[PDB]
Amino acid sequence: HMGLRGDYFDNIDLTNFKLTRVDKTIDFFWGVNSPAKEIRNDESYSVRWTGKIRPLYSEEYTFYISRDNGVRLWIDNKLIIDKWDNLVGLEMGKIYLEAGKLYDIKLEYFNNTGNGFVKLEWSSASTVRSIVPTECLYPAEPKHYGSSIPGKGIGLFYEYFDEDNLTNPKEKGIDSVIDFNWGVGSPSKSINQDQKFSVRWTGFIQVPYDGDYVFYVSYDDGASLWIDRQLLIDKWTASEINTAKTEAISLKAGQRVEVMLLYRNTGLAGSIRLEWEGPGIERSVVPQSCLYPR
Ligand SMILES: [Ca+2]
Ligand SMILES: [Ca+2]
Ligand SMILES: [Ca+2]
Ligand SMILES: [Ca+2]
């Protein structure tokens, strides 16, 4: 097989996996739209490509990247282009390689609003500058993503607001999990891209195992968490990047815990994650399987 394995993530930071596929070459121009139907069309996404690269010659290779936005490129486990930033780069790194030998390649990429593109070229004394071609790329095996916790959940209900104070609603729906890092983007193109917006998630968490749980909310820059109509985390005006947690709560398998999670961005970047720890559950995003909208 030819190409590299692309793992596509719904956030700017290589979190919240939505799709793996084999891409024949790294040569993408996405405009302001998503790379794939599985990735929310909100202008905040990221990709990791992994596999092997086979040069034809025993020569110093130059790798060229065109990027919007950030890229990191490792060849033979050496980071040769380290450009994980919000600029637009039209980037080089050099490395000596041996003819016919297979080398590791890893390329990480993000889009943080606006246009998204990434193109990988190479040259050497005997290699005319070109897109790195498919016949020189071999895809990695898929890495598994996703929780082992079973259950019939489908997500929480969401309401997206154009103001930072839970007003001017623009969209509603279901979010599979609460694991978001939009950078300076909004949760949907229906929400103006001004870094001042808010979200209400509602529904129920159905508990998988008898024992004690702690909920963690990591936010930029305000959040409040209601559990069974008790306000357990009151950080609405915290205007900071931080994490907060509940006390331990004894819960039973099958118990339905009513949840209301309020979130806001008031400027610059925005992110929010709902995690838990529990019996047999290391601190981790509360999974879709345990989230219900009603
Ligand atoms: Ca996104
Ligand atoms: Ca961009
Ligand atoms: Ca706004
Ligand atoms: Ca912020």
* Residue 221 assigned ligand-binding role: yes
> β-strands 249-251, 270-278: how paired?
unpaired
**Contacts with 144 (C-beta within 8 Å, 6 or more apart), sequence order:** none
Domain 156-292 part of CATH 3.10.20.30: no
Looking at residue 110, its amino acid is F
Closest to 63 (Cα-Cα) out of 136, 130, 135: 130
CATH 3.90.182.10 domain span(s) along the chain: 4-139, 156-292
Burial class of residue 87 in the structure, from the number of CB atoms within 10 Å of its CB (0-12 exposed, 13-18 middle, 19+ buried):
exposed
* Residue 234 assigned ligand-binding role: no
Rg (CA), the chain: 22
Q: Which ligand is nearest to the CA of 270?
A: 4
Instruction: Using the mean position of ligand 2's atoms as its centre, give its distance from the Cα of residue 69 in Å.
Output: 5
Instruction: Using the mean position of ligand 4's atoms as its centre, give its distance from the Cα of residue 91 in Å.
Output: 30
Closest to 73 (Cα-Cα) out of 4, 15, 145: 4
Q: Which residues surround ligand 1, an ion (CB under 5 A)?
A: 10, 40, 42, 44
Closest to 93 (Cα-Cα) out of 117, 67, 126, 57: 67
CATH pick for 4-139 out of 3.40.50.1100, 3.90.1150.10, 3.40.50.1000, 3.90.182.10:
3.90.182.10
* Residue 42 assigned ligand-binding role: yes
Q: What are phi and psi of 135, to 5 degrees?
A: -70, -10
Q: What are phi and psi of 16, to 5 degrees?
A: 70, 70
Residue 148: other Cβ atoms inside 10 A:
10
* Residue 27 assigned ligand-binding role: no
The approach used to solve this structure was X-ray
- Classify residue 289 by its DSSP letter: G
Give strand ranges (E) for 207-255. Answer: 211-227, 230-245, 249-251
Instruction: Using the mean position of ligand 4's atoms as its centre, give its distance from the Cα of residue 263 in Å.
Output: 11
Closest to 177 (Cα-Cα) out of 41, 44, 14, 290: 290
* Residue 11 assigned ligand-binding role: no
Resolution, expressed in angstroms to one decimal: 1.1
**Contacts with 229 (C-beta within 8 Å, 6 or more apart), sequence order:** 258
Maximum C-alpha span of the chain: 69
Instruction: Using the mean position of ligand 2's atoms as its centre, give its distance from the Cα of residue 192 in Å.
Output: 16
DSSP H/E element including 257: strand 256-265
**Contacts with 106 (C-beta within 8 Å, 6 or more apart), sequence order:** 48, 49, 50, 72, 73, 74
Instruction: Using the mean position of ligand 2's atoms as its centre, give its distance from the Cα of residue 214 in Å.
Output: 36
Q: Say which residue the tokens 């209301």 belong to.
A: 260
Per-residue buried b or exposed e for 57-71, using 16+ beta carbons within 10 Å of the residue's own CB: eebebbbbbbbbbbb
Closest to 221 (Cα-Cα) out of 232, 237, 234, 233: 237
Tokens of 120: 């990988």
* Residues found in the chain: 294
* Residue 99 assigned ligand-binding role: no
Distances (CA, A) of 202 to 39, 57, 225, 241: 22, 58, 10, 23
Instruction: Using the mean position of ligand 1's atoms as its centre, give its distance from the Cα of residue 186 in Å.
Output: 8
Instruction: Using the mean position of ligand 4's atoms as its centre, give its distance from the Cα of residue 100 in Å.
Output: 48
Three-state secondary structure call for residue 288:
helix
Give strand ranges (E) for 103-196. Answer: 103-112, 116-123, 130-131, 137-139, 156-161, 169-175, 179-183
**Contacts with 192 (C-beta within 8 Å, 6 or more apart), sequence order:** 162, 186
The angle subtended at Cα 171 by Cα 168 and Cα 173, nearest 5°, is 140
Residue 15: other Cβ atoms inside 10 A:
16
